[PDB]
Design an enzyme around this catalytic site. Structure first.
Site, PDB file in Angstrom:
ATOM      1  N   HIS A  25       2.695  -1.297  -4.619  1.00  0.00           N
ATOM      2  CA  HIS A  25       1.971  -0.503  -5.652  1.00  0.00           C
ATOM      3  C   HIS A  25       0.549  -1.013  -5.835  1.00  0.00           C
ATOM      4  O   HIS A  25      -0.221  -0.291  -6.528  1.00  0.00           O
ATOM      5  CB  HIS A  25       2.754  -0.513  -6.978  1.00  0.00           C
ATOM      6  CG  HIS A  25       2.848   0.820  -7.658  1.00  0.00           C
ATOM      7  ND1 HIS A  25       3.144   0.968  -8.999  1.00  0.00           N
ATOM      8  CD2 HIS A  25       2.808   2.056  -7.147  1.00  0.00           C
ATOM      9  CE1 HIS A  25       3.243   2.267  -9.250  1.00  0.00           C
ATOM     10  NE2 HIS A  25       3.054   2.958  -8.149  1.00  0.00           N
ATOM     11  N   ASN A  73       0.693   2.559 -15.085  1.00  0.00           N
ATOM     12  CA  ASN A  73       0.986   3.854 -15.752  1.00  0.00           C
ATOM     13  C   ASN A  73       0.001   4.121 -16.877  1.00  0.00           C
ATOM     14  O   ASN A  73       0.072   5.242 -17.436  1.00  0.00           O
ATOM     15  CB  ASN A  73       2.424   3.963 -16.269  1.00  0.00           C
ATOM     16  CG  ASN A  73       2.715   3.091 -17.455  1.00  0.00           C
ATOM     17  OD1 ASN A  73       1.964   2.168 -17.775  1.00  0.00           O
ATOM     18  ND2 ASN A  73       3.859   3.355 -18.079  1.00  0.00           N
ATOM     19  N   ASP A  98      -1.381   3.614  -3.247  1.00  0.00           N
ATOM     20  CA  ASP A  98      -0.191   3.683  -2.397  1.00  0.00           C
ATOM     21  C   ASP A  98       0.382   5.082  -2.354  1.00  0.00           C
ATOM     22  O   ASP A  98       0.421   5.755  -3.399  1.00  0.00           O
ATOM     23  CB  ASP A  98       0.855   2.722  -2.948  1.00  0.00           C
ATOM     24  CG  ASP A  98       1.201   2.839  -4.407  1.00  0.00           C
ATOM     25  OD1 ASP A  98       0.261   2.839  -5.221  1.00  0.00           O
ATOM     26  OD2 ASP A  98       2.443   2.918  -4.733  1.00  0.00           O
ATOM     27  N   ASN A 119       2.545   7.223 -10.672  1.00  0.00           N
ATOM     28  CA  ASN A 119       2.412   7.093 -12.145  1.00  0.00           C
ATOM     29  C   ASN A 119       0.985   6.673 -12.543  1.00  0.00           C
ATOM     30  O   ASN A 119       0.614   6.859 -13.675  1.00  0.00           O
ATOM     31  CB  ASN A 119       3.438   6.151 -12.790  1.00  0.00           C
ATOM     32  CG  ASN A 119       3.507   4.728 -12.255  1.00  0.00           C
ATOM     33  OD1 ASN A 119       2.958   4.417 -11.203  1.00  0.00           O
ATOM     34  ND2 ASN A 119       4.221   3.847 -12.964  1.00  0.00           N
TER      35      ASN A 119
END
Length: 196
Positions: A25, A73, A98, A119
């Protein structure tokens, strides 16, 4: 402010902390940290915009770099006020991230479109809309929605890491085209990458 589709803000998405630095991520952080080292752009603490940011010259263009330190997020809580404060239009923004829907070693430049469930992008597009450019760094998919967390917060095996690292290095060589506004040529030359 920004000027046309000369890219002047490059964002890398990821999570803060040593425990996330090597996880899939953070692919966007990998790209922007390597870009900053290539061009000698200092990434320094930016608490006003909940991030680490820098400013410097890339190939004769004044460019800003941003790594949100919000957690993934909440990325829009950095990118949106930063881009608005510096009067940077989405058309002049590149966001590196990513991409679950592409293999490790695949990399693509996309303009517009949705978050594809990401997210971080989910926290940005509602505010500035979709018309920014994205460097989609393939990370592969773990094969169910329930597993996505463990996959993106995982440290890839060495072969996959090597594939991603090669794709990222390729994309670094195409940033000169992007800061010059040559988005079509950059898209062709980035999307053509193959690891072997």
């Amino acid at each position: 402010g920004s000027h046309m589709s000369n890219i002047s803000l490059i964002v890398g998405l990821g999570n803060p902390g040593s425990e996330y630095a090597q996880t899939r991520h953070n692919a966007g952080f990998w790209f922007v940290e390597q870009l900053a080292d290539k061009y000698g752009i200092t990434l320094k603490n930016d608490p006003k915009f909940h991030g680490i940011s820098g400013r410097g010259n890339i190939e004769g263009h004044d460019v800003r770099l941003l790594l949100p330190m919000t957690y993934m997020n909440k990325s829009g809580q950095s990118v949106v006020p930063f881009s608005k404060f510096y009067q940077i239009a989405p058309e002049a923004i590149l966001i590196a991230h990513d991409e679950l829907d592409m293999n490790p070693g695949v990399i693509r430049l996309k303009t517009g479109g949705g978050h594809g469930g990401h997210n971080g992008l989910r926290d940005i597009v509602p505010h500035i809309g979709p018309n920014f450019h994205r460097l989609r760094i393939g990370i592969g998919h773990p094969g169910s929605k329930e597993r996505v967390s463990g996959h993106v917060l995982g440290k890839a095996p060495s072969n996959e890491q090597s594939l991603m690292d090669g794709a990222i290095d390729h994309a670094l060589s195409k940033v000169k085209l992007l800061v010059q506004g040559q988005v079509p040529q950059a898209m062709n030359q980035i999307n053509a990458y193959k690891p072997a």
